[PDB]
Amino acid sequence: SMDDDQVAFSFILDNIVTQKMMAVPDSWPFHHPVNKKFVPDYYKVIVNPMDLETIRKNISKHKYQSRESFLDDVNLILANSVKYNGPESQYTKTAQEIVNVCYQTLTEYDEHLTQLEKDICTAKEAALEE
């Protein structure tokens, strides 16, 4: 209702992740960091690994003040799979649908998230004045 803007924004981001993005068919390889046991050279090819659980952990620490830095990490999941698996691999097409669902949901909530983003930024600027 008031002064809870960051808490609310993060709460919505987590629900987008758990309810929309993690619900993509066969998306489970993206729910957690790549297990080196199964992909022995992943961390030698991908310099900035990223996954949905890592994004949730970021959300719980309130890393994202706007959807833009949230989308940076989401789009990073797709670009990593493009680099490691190739553009037409089934992994990449799954990750591409994870990204699509993310954008579709953000667009559904656009006006609402803009309001939270404005209030979060103006509060941070006013709090750093002191």
Q: How far is the CB of 54 from ligand BMF (least distance, A)?
A: 11
Q: Residue 80 class from Cβ within 10 Å (0-12 exposed, 13-18 middle, 19+ buried)?
A: buried
Q: How far is the CB of 52 from ligand BMF (least distance, A)?
A: 9
Nearer to ligand BMF, 81 or 105 (CB): 81
Query: Interacting stretch for ligand BMF, rule CB under 6 A, among 3-11, 12-20, 30-38, 118-126?
Result: 30-38
Q: How far is the CB of 63 from ligand BMF (least distance, A)?
A: 21
Q: Does 32 bind ligand BMF (CB under 6 A)?
A: yes
Q: How far is the CB of 35 from ligand BMF (least distance, A)?
A: 3
Residue with tokens 């309810």: 19
Secondary structure of 34-100 in the HEC alphabet? Answer: CCCCCCCCHHHHCCCCCCHHHHHHHHHCCCCCCHHHHHHHHHHHHHHHHHHHCCCCHHHHHHHHHHH
Contacts of 3 (CB under 8 A, 6+ apart): 123
Residues at the site binding ligand BMF, with contacts judged by CB under 6 A: 29-30, 32, 34-35, 38-39, 81, 84-85, 91
